[PDB]
Design a binder for this molecule. Structure first.
Ligand SMILES: *SCCNC(=O)CCNC(=O)[C@H](O)C(C)(C)COP(=O)(O)OP(=O)(O)OC[C@H]1O[C@@H](n2cnc3c(N)ncnc32)[C@H](O)[C@@H]1OP(=O)(O)O
Lengths: 4, 188
């Protein structure tokens, strides 16, 4: 995930 | 990001939806930097819309990953006469391990929705659905085969409304999947  | 740029978007992007990869090839005075600027601004706007402290989409990130971005231009005439950009969706395949409802961890490599944004002023005008449909067709995937990186609630409502998608087993890896994802399940 890049949102974490 | 206002949708408009100090250069001609219609000249840059002749097609309604333009698909770009890590090479950021202009469709065929630095056209590539025009594309890079559009992606940079889109990524900053999306981050702000999702309450993120920094962008997850940018020109440099496109160049260093194996993601694909679909950019929707405005098909109407704008007063300033140089076209405009409505929004984008960014996808990429990722290796994941996902838990099903039968206690199994499954190794998978689905197409993932990684970023998705339509300018605030023109949300709820059907542009998101148009862009999503184009992406499904080109990628040759059905909606229940997707994983999504930390979807917003807005996107979950969108997916339920348009595709009847319902979330399935929750994961520990920040991705969301929908009923039908697993081989023993059935889509909506
Ligand atoms: S995971 C990151 C997803 N991106 C964002 O959350 C960024 C902000 N939102 C957007 O960029 C767009 O609103 C997205 C989510 C990309 C959807 O695109 P559109 O707004 O163009 O969608 P359509 O007009 O095609 O479909 C409208 C239906 O989508 C859901 N929806 C849109 N906006 C909202 C809000 N604010 N709150 C809840 N749901 C929302 C709804 O199902 C909407 O249908 P309604 O009958 O109007 O509720």
């Amino acid at each position: 995930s890049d949102k974490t | 990001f206002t949708m408009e740029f100090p250069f001609d978007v219609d000249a840059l992007f002749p097609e309604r939806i333009t698909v770009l990869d890590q090479h950021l090839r202009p469709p065929a005075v630095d056209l590539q930097q025009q594309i890079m600027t559009i992606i940079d601004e889109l990524g900053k706007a999306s981050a702000k819309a999702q309450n993120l402290s920094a962008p997850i989409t940018s020109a440099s990130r496109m160049q260093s990953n194996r993601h694909v971005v679909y950019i929707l231009k405005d098909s109407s005439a704008r007063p300033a006469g140089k076209g405009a950009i409505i929004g984008f969706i960014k996808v990429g395949y990722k290796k994941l391990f996902v838990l099903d409802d039968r206690e199994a961890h499954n190794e998978v490599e689905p197409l993932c929705i990684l970023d998705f944004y339509i300018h605030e002023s023109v949300q709820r005008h059907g542009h998101g659905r148009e862009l999503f449909q184009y992406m499904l067709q080109k990628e040759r995937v059905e909606p229940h085969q997707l994983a999504i990186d930390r979807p917003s609630q807005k996107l979950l409502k969108f997916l339920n409304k348009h595709y009847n998608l319902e979330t399935t087993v929750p994961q520990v890896n920040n991705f969301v999947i929908f009923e039908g994802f697993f081989a023993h399940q059935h889509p909506p």
